[PDB]
Ligand binder design. Structure first.
Ligand SMILES: COc1cccc2c1C(=O)c1c(O)c3c(c(O)c1C2=O)C[C@@](O)(C(=O)CO)C[C@@H]3O[C@H]1C[C@H](N)[C@@H](O)[C@H](C)O1
Lengths: 1022, 150, 50, 50, 50
């Protein structure tokens, strides 16, 4: 081919232009986004029932509701919690890469049936069904700075006026509110109300028909009478639409012309719907609005546009409406991106400079430099051709690739300025015969190569994906290169292609170097010993080298964990937050840019007891060293945050890839299996746990991820008496209910927007068991009785939250592997410890530990198939079940250079490093092929003699190898390997190669020629 | 889709079905007329009965099996237990009661429900102690029921 | 009997919500006196209706 | 599926009451397993006459 | 605070408008380049295209 191309090289430039054009369209046509989509698609199922408690949600709710999720398609496992405030989550994670639209349907649309026995309280607030993701794009916040706006007025307004703003913009995959929107609140007081002989009920019904919408004919429309002329539309009753109109309800009339309004029994007011999440940002009333991708738009444009939109519109509604951004995943990309093409770009530059040095020239260093770029640019429309997209995984995907792009270029031009030097024809046959000796080699080192990459797009789950990112990238990059070096390079440099010591001073060490080696090869098998050492030793390292996923990275935000004890309460958890605000604003001004904390969330389950506080730091810039960054800022916090009360406050940096498989940790759910109840399970739960901590050997930190039985104050209606006293068990129940958990009457419309109305007694009358009393039912005769009449109080313990693994009660426990030990050998103890527990009690794995378990280990079988097809290819570049066997024993030489990222640097075997550890066994075994080709080429052609060849064949190679080897090792040591911020996977990417490259040379030069003969002669023996 | 399409429509007759249909939910599904497969489950030591099994089975294993890909309908050769109130007329004719009566009972004395709680959700000036208020539960044994007061 | 009444009651809601949804080109509703409402979505061509 | 069903139950077998055995009547799987293997033997086999 | 868009035919129409001045461009360029490869002459095309 490159012969028929060197010829018309006017063509191999058209070709070089489409390929190029196609990465411009494709650069444009490309998604961009911090990561891609790598978690399995969960649907969560949210439910609320104002004032339940667990059993009362579990058994009014979860269940059944379970019971009937039953004939959706690809589902993996389901859990489910039911906790003490109404709520029911119920995620259902699904098989690998289903259809999310299609799951979610189905999931839901099979909800649709469900409902019928969901109870009228729930049916009304909606169950919504929707998609995993509970952190993405940015989180705008909306603050006051007057003391004008409470939460709710801020939440309202946001909901009133901007929430759809935003939620319709190029991107914007849905909006979600950090508040409510006004509520017709309506706070009863059994006093001002027993005075009228009225229960909440009559408050309830009153608000019902005083505020509804009633049908009403037109005037004709239907069949009318001969010759009419009037059609209109009659307009009966209409929703109330204020605090006023509401205060005017005839709840009663006594014979005195008596005027018992609503506000005479309560107090109307614009309120919020839920009252139990206190959001502030910097000491300050808050009401954010979270907002996610858009599925196939661009983190970068998108943020812009949302910044945009806000900007057009804060010219509006009074006071301070200051709009903060206390989270953006925007920098963290851009700043990556910028530093990524910084890498490529410069790793070229370096080619050019490491191109004077090796070739006195210029129109040859001008080659690698219009060929990489043409290999990249097309590796942009391969990506866009398998959908992919621009994200931190894919990016580094071609940086851990640079090495092999580059190399392939210098590799060709430089075979030309060997053969057009060493007594040779012009460009013409220089190339033709040059290209010729690499031609086959160049191809065939596709195959072999692809085989040490492809594999990797086959892996497990959540993980597998990351890999596939990397896998394609490299392939379609690398495999792109080959093709472009058999076509634009042969004919490129063949068409432009024609110190004071270094030149002859390299032509020195070369000679000196092959001597050395000529003795190596007298002795022969001498060094094969000094090799098995280097094998053996890798083996010691592999094992020693710690494991992981993606080294954490500083993201300019992290979190604080407040977690007040058992029965806590809001007021008293704020104070905590205020300190975790202060001891962040004060003892850390040069770094805290904004605390945004909120109580009633701490994703361990909700309730005045717990908040959580996300702080967002100032720019990495203004954060100099170690101490001024996260690991470090959080270091100090955490420790400075114990000394605090009896309120556990943690801080921690977000994990790499938010939505994904954190710690190398395990996830362990205890399921229930029979009758055993909450209690029995609680028994198992505890035994197992206690077990576990008497085994710090296998190391550990088992925890129940979930909550203790707390105490419960329990009314307990006395049916007899209630009949007996002439008092309907509905009226009791209700009145207790709406006094205390509130109930939600009907809606009404508020400056244009239907908005719920809630009825529930002021707080004053609802705080202490001791108030039960204030509360009085009308009974059958106009006799207003009280509690003690027909009810009795008792404390109990029970659950605030209640666990259930697919269909059925379940706990949840998670702990770490073992300073010492492997996630896998640790699973397996925790499962023996699980082996020997009270029958009934099952146990099964979730998260991460379905991944790791299921697929889990496959390194093996997938590598067999490379180390196999590496051979089968390689041998037919050669004709030999034996000669290939010399190109292989390279593999280790490259490994140990890599793996001394152990004992020079504080690192661990992790995707960023394996992917390196791949990229290095490319360069390496292709050194191997080229070389052992050149050593073939002689012998096969002009019989140039058993070793005569080996010595000559390295003799003609030590440049190329030393050439790129030099490009790269500088190519990687830049910021890559030394870096302040937006980094980490930087360190990861480099340190890998950087070290693994060293030896991949420094060992290679000597061994490979060894290898060649050691094997070509052994195979023709005695 | 089809499975889809079908239940778009359905869905606009929910709200005309009799509450009692309704409420034993309607189902839509896709699958094969014939059976994939039948899974006996007998018991060795005559330790439980025909009944007993069919409860255990429904309580135990009709779950997962229906919830579980391309399993798309498990018949169940049996039925799960239910609270049972084999009436007798004579009597309610005697003490002067109809099922209607009996029924309304059954909803009242057998029922789960929803207080509120003491640290009152939007609370007051300045308060420690918050915790839920539990009232009526859901009955739970042969016994609870028919001690229901008529 | 309800003019704006509908538009704010069903129509609005149903709209606030019509975000996310891929390939969507433009949406176009209208209340009604008789209280009927038609939200309408229309997506970039050759998109997959089902 | 069958495999999955079967190794569901299989997953809930150490915890039934006293003496309760999934038995296995009418199941249409293993023929389509045997059968389709029956053939396979034939391929190899008549490799060996040829 | 008032404005407009088009719908159906129109928004198709306008969309089909402003598209031509790319539809021509790119199509040209594709031929020109084809000719190059074909007639091995970074010059012969120039002709043809003129
Ligand atoms: C498994 O999902 C998660 C996991 C962990 C912790 C969290 C979440 C989570 O999803 C989550 C939220 O989705 C929301 C919030 C939130 O704090 C979390 C998590 O903490 C805070 C929020 O309630 C406010 O800040 C309101 O003032 C807004 C928002 O509400 C969402 C979630 C509701 N359940 C949903 O029905 C509503 C419309 O949007």
């Amino acid at each position: 081919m490159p012969n028929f191309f060197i010829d018309r090289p006017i063509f191999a430039w058209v070709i070089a232009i489409i390929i190029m054009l196609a990465g411009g369209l494709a650069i444009l046509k490309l998604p961009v986004a911090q990561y891609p989509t790598i978690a399995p698609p969960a649907v969560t199922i949210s439910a609320s029932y104002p004032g339940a408690d667990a059993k009362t949600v579990q058994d009014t709710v979860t269940q059944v509701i379970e019971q009937n999720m039953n004939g959706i398609d690809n589902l993996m496992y389901m859990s489910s919690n039911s906790d003490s405030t109404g709520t029911v989550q119920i995620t259902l994670t699904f098989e690998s890469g289903t259809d999310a639209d299609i799951a979610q349907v189905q999931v839901q649309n099979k909800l649709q049936l469900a409902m019928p026995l969901l109870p009228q309280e729930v049916q009304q607030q909606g169950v919504s069904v929707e998609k995993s993701s509970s952190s993405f794009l940015m989180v705008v916040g909306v603050i006051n700075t007057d003391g004008t706006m409470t939460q709710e007025d801020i939440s309202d307004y946001v909901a009133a006026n901007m929430k759809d703003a935003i939620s319709r913009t190029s991107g914007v995959g849905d909006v979600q509110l950090f508040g409510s929107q006004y509520a017709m609140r309506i706070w009863m007081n059994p006093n001002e109300l027993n005075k009228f002989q009225l229960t909440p009920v009559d408050v309830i019904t009153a608000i019902k028909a005083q505020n509804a919408q009633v049908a009403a004919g037109q005037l004709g429309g239907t069949p009318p009478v001969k010759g009419q002329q009037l059609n209109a539309s009659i307009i009966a009753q209409t929703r109330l639409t204020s605090t006023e109109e509401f205060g005017k309800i005839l709840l009663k009339v006594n014979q005195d012309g008596s005027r018992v309004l609503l506000r005479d029994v309560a107090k109307i007011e614009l309120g919020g719907e839920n009252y139990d999440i206190i959001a502030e940002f910097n000491g300050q009333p808050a009401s954010g609005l979270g907002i996610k991708l858009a599925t196939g738009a661009n983190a970068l444009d998108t943020a812009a546009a949302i910044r945009a939109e806000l900007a057009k519109m804060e010219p509006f509604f009074p006071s301070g409406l200051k709009i903060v951004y206390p989270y953006d995943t925007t920098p963290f990309v851009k700043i990556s991106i910028h530093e990524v093409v910084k890498t490529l770009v410069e790793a070229i530059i370096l080619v050019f400079l490491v191109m004077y040095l090796f070739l006195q020239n210029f129109r040859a260093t001008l080659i690698p430099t219009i060929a990489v770029p043409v290999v990249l640019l097309g590796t942009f429309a391969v990506l866009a051709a398998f959908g992919f997209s621009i994200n931190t995984l894919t990016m580094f995907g071609m940086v851990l690739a640079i090495g092999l792009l580059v190399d392939d270029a210098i590799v060709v031009v430089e075979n030309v300025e060997r053969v057009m030097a060493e007594e040779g024809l012009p460009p013409k046959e220089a190339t033709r015969k040059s290209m010729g000796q690499i031609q086959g080699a160049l191809v065939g080192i596709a195959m072999v190569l692809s085989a040490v990459f492809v594999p990797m797009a086959f892996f497990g789950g959540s993980t597998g994906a990351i890999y596939r990112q990397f896998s394609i990238t490299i392939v379609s990059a690398m495999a792109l290169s080959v093709l472009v070096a058999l076509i634009l390079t042969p004919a490129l440099c063949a068409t432009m292609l024609k110190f004071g010591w270094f030149n002859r001073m390299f032509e020195k060490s070369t000679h000196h170097y092959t001597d050395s080696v000529g003795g190596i090869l007298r002795s022969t098998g001498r060094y094969l010993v000094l090799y098995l050492i280097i094998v053996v030793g890798m083996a010691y390292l592999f094992v020693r080298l710690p494991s992981s996923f993606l080294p954490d990275e500083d993201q300019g935000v992290f979190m604080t964990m407040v977690q007040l004890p058992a029965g806590a309460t809001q007021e008293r958890t704020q104070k905590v937050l205020n300190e975790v605000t202060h001891y962040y604003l004060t003892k850390e001004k040069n770094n805290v840019e904004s605390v945004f904390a909120v109580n009633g969330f701490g994703f361990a389950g909700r309730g005045q007891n717990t908040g959580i506080a996300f702080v967002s730091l100032k720019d990495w810039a203004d954060r100099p060293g170690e101490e001024n960054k996260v690991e470090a800022i959080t270091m100090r916090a955490t420790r400075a945050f114990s000394q605090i009360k009896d309120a556990m406050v943690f801080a921690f940096n977000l994990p790499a890839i938010v939505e994904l498989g954190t710690a190398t940790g395990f996830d362990f759910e205890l399921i229930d299996q029979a009758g055993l109840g909450h209690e029995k399970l609680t028994q198992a739960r505890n035994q197992l746990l206690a077990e576990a901590a008497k085994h710090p050997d296998m190391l550990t930190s088992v925890r129940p991820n979930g909550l203790e039985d707390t105490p419960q104050f329990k009314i307990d209606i006395d049916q007899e008496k209630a009949q007996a006293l002439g008092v309907s068990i509905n009226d009791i129940n209700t009145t207790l209910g709406a006094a205390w958990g509130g109930s939600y009457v009907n809606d009404f419309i508020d400056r244009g927007r239907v908005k719920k109305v809630y009825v529930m007694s002021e707080a004053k009358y609802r705080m202490l068991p001791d108030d039960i009393g204030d509360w009085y039912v009308r009974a059958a005769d106009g006799q207003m009785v009280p509690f003690s009449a027909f009810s009795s109080s008792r404390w109990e313990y029970g659950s605030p939250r209640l666990e259930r693994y697919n269909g059925l009660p379940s706990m949840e426990i998670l702990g770490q592997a073992a300073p010492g030990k492997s996630t896998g050998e640790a699973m397996e103890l925790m499962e023996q410890l699980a082996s020997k527990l009270p029958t009934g009690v099952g146990y099964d794995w979730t998260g991460m530990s379905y991944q790791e378990r299921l697929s889990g280990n496959q390194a093996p079988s997938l590598y067999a198939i490379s180390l196999i097809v590496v051979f089968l290819c390689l041998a037919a570049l050669y004709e030999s079940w034996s000669i290939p066997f010399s190109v292989m024993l390279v593999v280790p030489l490259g490994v140990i250079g890599a793996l001394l990222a152990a004992t020079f640097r504080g690192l661990t075997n992790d995707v960023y490093f394996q992917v390196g550890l791949l990229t290095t066994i490319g360069l390496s075994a292709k050194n191997a092929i080229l070389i052992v080709e050149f050593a073939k080429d002689l012998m096969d052609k002009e019989g140039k003699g058993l070793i005569e060849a080996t010595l000559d064949a390295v003799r003609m190679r030590l440049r190329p190898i030393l050439m790129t080897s030099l490009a790269f090792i500088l190519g990687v040591m830049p910021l890559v390997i030394s870096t302040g911020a937006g980094s980490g996977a930087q360190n990861a990417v480099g340190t890998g190669v950087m070290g693994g490259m060293v030896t991949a040379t420094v060992l290679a030069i000597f061994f490979v020629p060894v290898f060649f003969v050691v094997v070509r002669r052994r195979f023709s023996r005695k």
